[PDB]
């Protein structure tokens, strides 16, 4: 009848998941939040591991993932923060939540915008996802083309509205914003 | 005790598959070789369908796939041609067989080499696989860079040895040359 307890029905009701899936996602939270300290919290030290271990997204954006999972900005991931953040990568999660998330992900230094050197590191990391590693000058052409397409109100930075326009023409930037195993989950 | 009959043990023994898998791949051959004519042969007309239907590789290279599946060059795919050609896309199939196949695939007009305009249509089709559709001038830079890297003995055409060198530095050109469901198959 414990501390940190959250009725699964609660999460269930604000997310694509269901009670059983929520209940199931607790099992996995316990694993990740106990590796090193056992305080019902995922320390960033322990996010690394679980991502390095059962590989999900990517190593150099684990600080970026950890950062946007950390919704109530307080340095750790709690269970409901984790379930609500994972729920965004669900197949049926509204595309608004996906676009927004993906933007928070890319705003590398957390400043409310996406700046040209963050577009670049992004584009590099997506390209290397699809096994393409390109010349430094192939890259700043692409990054230049992308940046003036995106930066509609012409002022050196992409805001959440121009992003939304940009992504509507470039839907593969939010490709990874969905993980299709999350439709029915796999015991382990 | 029929015509066109081939002991499954036979195929089994020259391929990554096993008797049961061979036996299972017969079921699927019957489907594809009967759609339109029922002569135990896959006519190209019927290759199209099955690829348009239960999607595998890609629509505009279905003529290229059909062409290299057609090993004994006689205009149709027979059962053992089909099993031996599919067996190449298997996870455990030797990488020689994969590189060779991929080369036959790209030699678009069937001339024994890969020519610059075939490298180009290739690169375009791989790029569009990974959701990248690029400028016509981003493209001939890439295609130019790739073509002089590949065409070692400097003479306007890639042969099977320079290809082999090229692919060793570019292992993602043979990415699709493997299909991981073929490790244990899925009834339907
Ligand atoms: Ca902990
Ligand atoms: Ca938090
Ligand atoms: Ca930023
Ligand atoms: Ca037929
Ligand atoms: Ca044939
Ligand atoms: Ca050719
Ligand atoms: Mn702007
Ligand atoms: Mn050559």
Curated annotation (Swiss-Prot), chains A, B:
GO terms for cellular component: calcineurin complex; cytoplasm; nucleus; plasma membrane. Residues 21-56, 57-92, 94-129, 138-173 form the EF-hand domain. The calcium-binding domain (165-176) of the EF-hand 4 can also interacts with a manganese ion. The N-terminal 18 amino acids are sufficient for the cell membrane targeting of a heterologous protein. Disruption phenotype: Delayed development and flowering. The record marks 130 as: Involved in dimerization. Binds 4 Ca(2+) ions per subunit. One of its GO terms (molecular function) is calcium-dependent protein serine/threonine phosphatase activity. GO terms for biological process: calcium-mediated signaling; detection of calcium ion; hypotonic salinity response; intracellular potassium ion homeostasis. The chain holds residues 15 to 202 of 222 of the full protein. It is a lipid-anchor. It comes from Arabidopsis thaliana (Mouse-ear cress). Its main location: membrane. It is found in: Cell membrane; Cytoplasm; Nucleus. Its cofactor is Ca(2+). Interacts with CIPK24/SOS2, CIPK6/SIP3, CIPK10/SIP1, CIPK11/SIP4 and CIPK15/SIP2. Homodimer, mediated by calcium-binding. Binds to ABCG36. This is Calcineurin B-like protein 4. Keywords: Cell membrane, Cytoplasm, Lipoprotein, Manganese, Membrane, Myristate, Nucleus, Phosphoprotein, Repeat. Belongs to the calcineurin regulatory subunit family. Both N-myristoylation and calcium-mediated conformational changes are essential for its function. Phosphorylated by CIPK6 and CIPK24.
